[PDB]
Amino acid sequence: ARKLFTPITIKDMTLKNRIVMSPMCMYSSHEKDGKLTPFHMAHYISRAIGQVGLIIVEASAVNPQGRITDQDLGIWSDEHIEGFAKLTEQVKEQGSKIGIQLAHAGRKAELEGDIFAPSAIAFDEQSATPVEMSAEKVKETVQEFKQAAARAKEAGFDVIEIHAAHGYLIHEFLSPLSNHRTDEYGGSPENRYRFLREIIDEVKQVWDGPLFVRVSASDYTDKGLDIADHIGFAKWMKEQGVDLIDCSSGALVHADINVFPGYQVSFAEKIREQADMATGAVGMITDGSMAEEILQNGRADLIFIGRELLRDPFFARTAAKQLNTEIPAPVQYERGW
Amino acid sequence: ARKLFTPITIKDMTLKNRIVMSPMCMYSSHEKDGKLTPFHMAHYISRAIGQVGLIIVEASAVNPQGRITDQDLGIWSDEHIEGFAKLTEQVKEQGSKIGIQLAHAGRKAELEGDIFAPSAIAFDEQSATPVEMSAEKVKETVQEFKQAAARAKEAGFDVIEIHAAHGYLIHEFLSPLSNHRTDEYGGSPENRYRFLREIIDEVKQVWDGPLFVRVSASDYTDKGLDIADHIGFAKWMKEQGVDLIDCSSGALVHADINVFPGYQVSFAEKIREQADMATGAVGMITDGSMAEEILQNGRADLIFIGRELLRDPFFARTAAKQLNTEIPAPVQYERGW
Amino acid sequence: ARKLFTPITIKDMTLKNRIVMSPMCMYSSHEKDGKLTPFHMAHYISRAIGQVGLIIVEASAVNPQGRITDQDLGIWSDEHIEGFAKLTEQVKEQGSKIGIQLAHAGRKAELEGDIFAPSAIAFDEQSATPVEMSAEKVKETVQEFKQAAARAKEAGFDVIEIHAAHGYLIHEFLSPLSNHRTDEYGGSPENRYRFLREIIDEVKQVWDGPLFVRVSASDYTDKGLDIADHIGFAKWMKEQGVDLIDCSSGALVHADINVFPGYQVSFAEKIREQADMATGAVGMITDGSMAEEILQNGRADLIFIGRELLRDPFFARTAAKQLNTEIPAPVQYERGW
Amino acid sequence: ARKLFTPITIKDMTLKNRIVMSPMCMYSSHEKDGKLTPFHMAHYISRAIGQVGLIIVEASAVNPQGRITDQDLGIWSDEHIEGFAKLTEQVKEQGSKIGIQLAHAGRKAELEGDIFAPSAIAFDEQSATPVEMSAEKVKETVQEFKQAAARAKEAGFDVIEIHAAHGYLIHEFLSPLSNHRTDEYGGSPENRYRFLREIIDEVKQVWDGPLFVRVSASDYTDKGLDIADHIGFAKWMKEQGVDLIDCSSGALVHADINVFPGYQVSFAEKIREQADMATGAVGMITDGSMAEEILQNGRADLIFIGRELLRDPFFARTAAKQLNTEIPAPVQYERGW
Numbered sequence A, B, C, D: 001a002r003k004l005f006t007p008i009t010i011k012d013m014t015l016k017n018r019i020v021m022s023p024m025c026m027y028s029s030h031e032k033d034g035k036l037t038p039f040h041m042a043h044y045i046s047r048a049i050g051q052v053g054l055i056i057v058e059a060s061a062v063n064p065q066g067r068i069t070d071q072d073l074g075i076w077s078d079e080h081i082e083g084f085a086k087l088t089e090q091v092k093e094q095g096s097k098i099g100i101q102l103a104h105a106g107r108k109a110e111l112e113g114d115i116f117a118p119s120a121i122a123f124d125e126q127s128a129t130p131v132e133m134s135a136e137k138v139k140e141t142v143q144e145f146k147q148a149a150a151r152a153k154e155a156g157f158d159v160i161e162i163h164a165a166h167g168y169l170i171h172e173f174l175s176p177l178s179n180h181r182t183d184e185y186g187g188s189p190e191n192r193y194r195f196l197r198e199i200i201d202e203v204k205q206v207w208d209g210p211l212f213v214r215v216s217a218s219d220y221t222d223k224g225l226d227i228a229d230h231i232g233f234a235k236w237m238k239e240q241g242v243d244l245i246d247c248s249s250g251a252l253v254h255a256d257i258n259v260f261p262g263y264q265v266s267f268a269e270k271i272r273e274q275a276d277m278a279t280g281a282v283g284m285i286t287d288g289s290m291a292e293e294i295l296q297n298g299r300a301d302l303i304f305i306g307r308e309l310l311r312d313p314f315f316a317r318t319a320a321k322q323l324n325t326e327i328p329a330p331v332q333y334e335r336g337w
């Protein structure tokens, strides 16, 4: 069978195909309490019916002030467990595996009141200046990722992904453009990586399953991080037990980015080869032919699909047809697929 | 703009477009009690997110022995109201109108114990011979359609459709091939239509909203019903206040049917023109071009889509693209659609 | 199989499928002598390689002053025979049948010098007033259609189509909006039809093969011709031996026309049913599903494709795929189709 | 504009886009004289009307016994000039540039009589054993490529490509699996490359325009040539003035090849980077998205399309639509494109 529909096993978790629903914020928690709503249930479960191998739930805040907006999903309270337990059970029942992206928006948080970051530097001219986290606060945040991971495990998730990309809190600590700290969390690449290092180690104390980390492989800015920097971080993550690196890019600050089909694939290929780390490719991949080429030419291990899954929830079927192959259909739709 | 995406008003109900999700059994009520399950919620709500103007819920039995299978949805108990109330609230919240198809499988019921029909004539060689309904039993069944309609209203449905097609109970009374009764419910076309006439009148005593009736416009069999007979029934339904006739065909008995794109459209066009009744076209309609042609040439008023919505839940978007036009996307998917 | 790809026989001509390349002017006779050029050869022959059942060559003038533009093809001289003979030989060699549309632009001719029409009435504000043809001039023109038909036969064409549509000379005589004559060629519907009647009879004196006539089934204007008038003309054409009526519409004068997929199909269906005449459907038909629906529901006998064949010369292949069926490919492309 | 539709200049020749019609044998010279036929004219010219930037004419034999079949095109006689001159003139008139692939089938020639190769080793068990070319014959063949190039120049071609791939004569000399010669044309990579070296140098004495060379970048066989070998040959070709290397693979002998979308792209990327040579990518590239990715990620300079151009002669238009961009349409089809 096509590589796109060939299984892969990661830490006891076996995915039936290589299609992954990339995490995408829905801004639909209208009660502003970070809880799930019927919309979220239908939104996610429908792609499970659609045969996506792994569905990654949108950025879920580990602290209420770490939300991007007050409509974001959260996982900062035990009260969030009940809802997530229902979602994981139903997604798995339809045949898919499910993961959750643990997040903290840092200086890009669009909330009232003080927002936090490694240094008091605003995202742009239209944003509020964040408050520099005290060492105590940085360590409490590490514990919040750990506590959130514990809740995710209890809720039944198969995979946990750490959001270290798109200019949010962890990415802010990683890049010299946003981190000007003078303590143990700033300076050398070792110190800039320390926040992520501690998060990974603490999460490992409560979670032994598949662990993914999403990164922005380049800042596309002078004096910022580039692929060489991320190959270095990737080697350190490998040593810590990270199973796969989800390769995105940009958004730390505004930058000129040449966007085209497969524009972020070179990052996934370089990290995979140089860091001997499994990688996820993402970025304007909209058909089965490109997905297959990426996998077959050894550029990545999983194909993350975002916007095409918003246009076509049953992308798996469409891709199978494009590749002239067959895949199992959800039982209820056998007479249509 | 395109007619397919132009609003239409029926009674006090306005549909935002003319695309309808044709009723389709999901055989997913696993507890065998006719109640809804999480799968049903995701299945239906996802097409509401997908912008379908009107979603018609699958055949729902008005009596437990009227189910096609023990895994069918039901509406014979007040215990069914709670679940349906949640479903209608969520589908409408996503922007669509919702209907329910009231049904009774008659001699095609696949259940243990006696099954019923107008006459003791089996569907085929592999089916049990049904019990001829006594006149009182027929009247009790009319009351059950009435009681089911009352529950549908309480649950919040916008439209009610009577299932008088596909060889089920009502169709069985309508056709001389299956109705050999010699009492008030058999013989002349008027008497064969009496059961449906009484159901329509009783339903109208508890429901004043949009009322649709789905028919099989031909039996494709010698001595059976043909389009001329249905044009006649349509005129009577118009007099009774039926708002639209959903035009399907066949299934009373096995028959040779030439299937092709738009194979049932001639039924919708003839009933529309000769009975001055709004009609719904259904049958191998899979793209926006054909849908627009049917509406623009005056062959039907609503376009019912079945299997294409199982392959593409977001058919509305696909059709809009095919017609080189734009439609509103669910707010959450604005950056993908 | 699919009706679209089932053979059909007209007289002594059998078409391998029911797809027809609608006549389309290319304005490529640069020497202004009506002769063919290399571009015409590649343009037409490529659709023969593409498996179109019947290819109809663009409007070819029967008199030099009957051209739409000085870049049009012509068939008014024996000097035109040599070129056409080469074209018919090559198109037929590739497996298709070929026809030619005999024409005269009348008052819509864009040439220097006097132009002719049934009455001295200009097409519009930006057009020259035509000279009213004397009775003798009308008779000379009938002889020119006859002489052109004889040349078409000598050149090897399989079908001859008379252009009686789109506001050109013959259509001008047919409509009371443009024909105000008081002699034998004007007044009653019979007299307005006389010019076409004589052309058909004279052409039949030199041509006994398939004869098509393209009409504009409606003027979409008050006091102008409508489908009822054309059903009448169709009955007369049937009596005269015309084999098929190619159903287009409009262009006699400017008018508001609602265009959409299959907007001219009702004309083909009504003429077919009421005049018992084979018809060709044309007008925004761009896919195999609609083509099959038109044929299966008995709305027309041949499907004429214009613009979609300019976008996709191999539409036959595309349509076959859309209908989930297989057709023979040109031998040279067996490893691609 | 998209890179796929961005120009590129090679030795005074400017291509308007990066789409190239890969050379494809048509086996249509029915007179067995290597001359062009109307089919060839329509076949090639239609893709020029279709806006392909560069059209490469199929393998054309430099010696009659170098044909693959007796139906192949040839360029071994001055009599072939007349026909080619007409083809180049007409393709250029439609807006495209045109090239020709100079070839000699070697041991894969399917002709009666002795066939030639560097060594007496058959292609497979179903093929005739070739005659080992004498040194005199090898040198005469070099002169035939030179003489053929002179004819191509006189005929008006814009580009000349040397066929050194797919197991034909030149490839046979390059690989140790097929070349066991003990003279100056066999042994070391220098001697195995000598035949090609002399062909390039002699062709340069009569042709100063764009020069392409198509190679099979791997034999996919133990002890055969691999990408490392071809990177080496590429460096030598660069020194000799070759402008671009058309990167194909296989066919020297039967081998197990994993075929998938873009399966030969790694060869084009590696040769481009390591030999600093412009390259052409080819192999299961069927859409504009993949074509754009290949160009944008710097994997090749030109995108060669074979089978998709047999299915869709107007691939350029399709690709433009897929990339959401606009390109000029042939004047005659402005109302369709």
Ligand SMILES: Cc1cc2nc3c(=O)[nH]c(=O)nc-3n(C[C@H](O)[C@H](O)[C@H](O)COP(=O)(O)O)c2cc1C
Binding pocket: A022, A023, A024, A025, A026, A058, A059, A101, A163, A165, A166, A214, A248, A282, A283, A284, A285, A304, A305, A306, A307, A308, B332, B335, B336
């Ligand atoms: C509406 C929307 C919401 C998104 N939310 C998230 C998110 O919560 N976490 C994340 O890592 N990326 C997020 N992304 C980025 C996507 O996951 C994905 O990486 C990006 O769209 C590139 O892929 P695509 O071209 O397949 O859409 C979002 C994108 C969109 C359009």
Ligand SMILES: Cc1cc2nc3c(=O)[nH]c(=O)nc-3n(C[C@H](O)[C@H](O)[C@H](O)COP(=O)(O)O)c2cc1C
Binding pocket: A332, A335, A336, B022, B023, B024, B025, B026, B058, B059, B101, B163, B165, B166, B214, B248, B282, B283, B284, B285, B304, B305, B306, B307, B308
């Ligand atoms: C899985 C499945 C379930 C169906 N269930 C119902 C039903 O409950 N009631 C009904 O009236 N028709 C039912 N139908 C018939 C469809 O509503 C529809 O009329 C038919 O499929 C023709 O349309 P299509 O070609 O768009 O699918 C069902 C069809 C399928 C394939």
Ligand SMILES: Cc1cc2nc3c(=O)[nH]c(=O)nc-3n(C[C@H](O)[C@H](O)[C@H](O)COP(=O)(O)O)c2cc1C
Binding pocket: C022, C023, C024, C025, C026, C058, C059, C101, C163, C165, C166, C214, C248, C282, C283, C284, C285, C304, C305, C306, C307, C308, D332, D335, D336
């Ligand atoms: C460029 C062009 C040239 C045409 N030339 C002719 C012609 O010579 N004769 C004719 O009867 N119709 C002519 N037509 C009308 C077409 O044959 C056809 O009936 C019309 O485009 C409707 O079909 P379509 O939607 O498939 O294109 C032409 C149309 C176009 C766009």
Ligand SMILES: Cc1cc2nc3c(=O)[nH]c(=O)nc-3n(C[C@H](O)[C@H](O)[C@H](O)COP(=O)(O)O)c2cc1C
Binding pocket: C332, C335, C336, D022, D023, D024, D025, D026, D058, D059, D101, D163, D165, D166, D214, D248, D282, D283, D284, D285, D304, D305, D306, D307, D308
């Ligand atoms: C019918 C046919 C004829 C071909 N003839 C030639 C040829 O003359 N010269 C050549 O170098 N390749 C030839 N090829 C190989 C193609 O040019 C092309 O490299 C191959 O099909 C891979 O690309 P594709 O997937 O885009 O078709 C031919 C392929 C086919 C299917």
Ligand SMILES: O=[N+]([O-])c1ccc(O)cc1
Binding pocket: A025, A059, A068, A165, A166
């Ligand atoms: O809402 N969005 O567009 C987002 C949200 C989170 C993220 O990581 C990237 C984009």
Ligand SMILES: O=[N+]([O-])c1ccc(O)cc1
Binding pocket: A038, A039, A041, A042, A043, A045, B038, B039, B041, B042, B043, B045
């Ligand atoms: O839409 N859904 O999938 C749902 C909706 C509500 C619910 O309680 C469970 C699942």
Ligand SMILES: O=[N+]([O-])c1ccc(O)cc1
Binding pocket: B025, B059, B068, B165, B166
């Ligand atoms: O399950 N099914 O296939 C069905 C069920 C009901 C109906 O009206 C038609 C078909």
Ligand SMILES: O=[N+]([O-])c1ccc(O)cc1
Binding pocket: C038, C039, C041, C042, C043, C045, D038, D039, D041, D042, D043, D045
């Ligand atoms: O393009 N073509 O098909 C042609 C061109 C020239 C010719 O003499 C015959 C056919």
Ligand SMILES: O=[N+]([O-])c1ccc(O)cc1
Binding pocket: C025, C059, C068, C165, C166
């Ligand atoms: O050039 N054109 O657009 C035309 C030419 C002839 C015709 O019958 C219709 C349209």
Ligand SMILES: O=[N+]([O-])c1ccc(O)cc1
Binding pocket: D025, D059, D068, D165, D166
């Ligand atoms: O005919 N064919 O399939 C061919 C011909 C020539 C070539 O280089 C490769 C394939």
